[PDB]
Design a binder for this molecule. Structure first.
Ligand code: GTP
Ligand code: GTP
Ligand code: MG
Ligand code: MG
Lengths: 169, 54, 54, 169
């Protein structure tokens, strides 16, 4: 049983770790060898927010730039978007504005957007300074968090935060 | 040496043919992904529960 | 001339990287075709009438 | 209404003209720009054989060499196979024995097999002499015909012949 069902979509460049964020949050599982997502899938998890039972319905698909038959239906009814980049790949961060534009074109203008810097475990390979991205999110009215699906850091916090914002909106 | 470093960069196949092979493979990828996406959107708009990772 | 004919055969990208791009694209093609074939065999073994070109 | 339903499969290398043989026979249509077949399809046509109504159920799929999830089900229940090569591409003819092996591995040993040299309109580009292939089919116990899906030559005859052999077997 649940009080509210919130559809949240994962978006961001291929390879940034969307599918592993999904698997970590909903199954407590991670795969170092995960391959590009072929179709569209979702998984659920219920959490408590302000005394109420929130069933999170988290959607996932490959972060392809091309037009896709699935795009409109993918964002349809979504109340939150986790916009993910790879902290160790600067290009995926450069492409954040492109994902913001996809949201304007295909999703509700009222959608809650959280910027997620994934792979924070890759300390030695970092290309995007935390302070830089933090500043960017603030300038653009987005919530921000850095995660590691690999070691679990901030994964729970990330989903908790976005779902709580959605609930209180 | 130079001739060794150069040799490693020369394919037995002409670059024109190599480029044609790139385009052919990209076309197929895009056609297959579209074919898949058309199936998936059909499911999304009929019974999206099929898409749940249970 | 030779240097012109040679130049046309040298990519800006290293052949090692070009080979990696070939393997990556072949892997995706094979994965996508398999994904499609798995859907199609499911239909073949439930309601093959779906496959008719009417 | 029909008296008998005969499943016949098209096989042979990619590009030989399987899909156009299907479209010519069942729809009287041809496409110069046809692309590789992505899935599996079939079309029907009813013909008269020895006073009886034979509904031909002609199946088609890409002529890929790889293992495919669809292969066993593709040959399942097939009573005839049109093994097609391209008269203007010698490699597709070289690969005929490979297709004969696929038939032994995946199809009924009683399957009626007809060897089809397609694209007979390509007189100037011919790489497989008609007499050579004719001899090969005889040596291997296969019926043989040359077709052009493009100009229609022998297409009707090809299907008529195989369906009639199946009926009389
Ligand atoms: N080091 C590290 N690697 C990660 C992390 N998250 C995912 N990966 C790895 O990065 C690669 C890509 O991860 P995926 O989850 O498949 O990325 P994706 O965003 O779903 O990719 P697409 O489906 O192609 O859009 C895989 O090898 C993962 O194991 C992480 O937090 N830290
Ligand atoms: N000249 C000529 N071209 C043909 C003939 N039949 C097919 N073609 C052409 O050959 C190409 C491939 O034909 P298809 O029917 O798509 O070949 P296929 O065997 O179905 O190929 P796959 O689906 O990849 O296995 C297309 O450009 C067709 O127009 C023919 O009889 N004569
Ligand atoms: Mg993925
Ligand atoms: Mg075809």
């Amino acid at each position: 049983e649940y009080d509210y069902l919130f559809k949240v979509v994962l978006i961001g460049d291929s390879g940034v770790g969307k599918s592993n964020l999904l698997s970590r949050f909903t199954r407590n599982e991670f795969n170092l060898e995960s391959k590009s997502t072929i179709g569209v899938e979702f998984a659920t998890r219920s959490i408590q927010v302000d005394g109420k039972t929130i069933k999170a319905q988290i959607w996932d698909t490959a972060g392809l730039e091309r037009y896709r038959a699935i795009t409109s239906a993918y964002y349809r009814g979504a109340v939150g978007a986790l916009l993910v980049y790879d902290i160790a790949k600067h290009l995926t961060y450069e492409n954040v504005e492109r994902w913001l534009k996809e949201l304007r074109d295909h999703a509700d203008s009222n959608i809650v957007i959280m910027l997620v810097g994934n792979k924070s475990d890759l300390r030695h390979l970092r290309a995007v300074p935390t302070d830089e991205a933090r500043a960017f999110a603030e300038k653009n009215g987005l919530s921000f968090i850095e995660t590691s699906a690999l070691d679990s850091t901030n994964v729970e916090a990330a989903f908790q935060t976005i779902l709580t914002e959605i609930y209180r909106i | 040496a130079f001739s060794e470093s150069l040799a490693a960069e020369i394919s037995s196949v002409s670059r024109d043919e190599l480029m044609e092979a790139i385009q052919k493979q990209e076309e197929i990828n895009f056609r297959l992904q579209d074919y898949i996406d058309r199936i998936i959107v059909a499911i999304m708009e009929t019974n999206p529960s099929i898409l749940e990772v249970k």
